[PDB]
Amino acid sequence: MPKHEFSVDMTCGGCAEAVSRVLNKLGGVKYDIDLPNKKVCIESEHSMDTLLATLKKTGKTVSYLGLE
Ligand SMILES: [Ag+]
Ligand SMILES: [Ag+]
């Protein structure tokens, strides 16, 4: 399954739950949240576009980094 990596401007520890919540609501995802590197990696059949839009529902700055 594709593994898409995103920069997410996660500024505090609460952002692990925040990101977990929006991704869980989308569903069909397994992820790893790297708070120190402000990066989220998502294993999914969802498009880069669907994942980008989903992460942006947090209200944060999100950019696509590429594949893991
Ligand atoms: Ag936060
Ligand atoms: Ag947050």
UniProtKB/Swiss-Prot annotation:
Instruction: Give expression by tissue.
Output: Ubiquitous.
Q: Sites of the modification Phosphoserine?
A: 47
> What GO terms in the biological process aspect are recorded for it?
copper ion export; copper ion transport; intracellular copper ion homeostasis; negative regulation of apoptotic process; response to oxidative stress
Q: Its domain of life? A: Eukaryota
Pfam hit, one: HMA
Tell what the record comments on domains: The heavy-metal-associated domain (HMA) coordinates a Cu(+) ion via the cysteine residues within the CXXC motif. The transfer of Cu(+) ion from ATOX1 to ATP7A involves the formation of a three-coordinate Cu(+)-bridged heterodimer where the metal is shared between the two metal binding sites of ATOX1 and ATP7A. The Cu(+) ion appears to switch between two coordination modes, forming two links with one protein and one with the other. Cisplatin, a chemotherapeutic drug, can bind the CXXC motif and hinder the release of Cu(+) ion.
Q: What is this protein called?
A: Copper transport protein ATOX1
Biological classification of the source: Eukaryota, Metazoa, Chordata, Craniata, Vertebrata
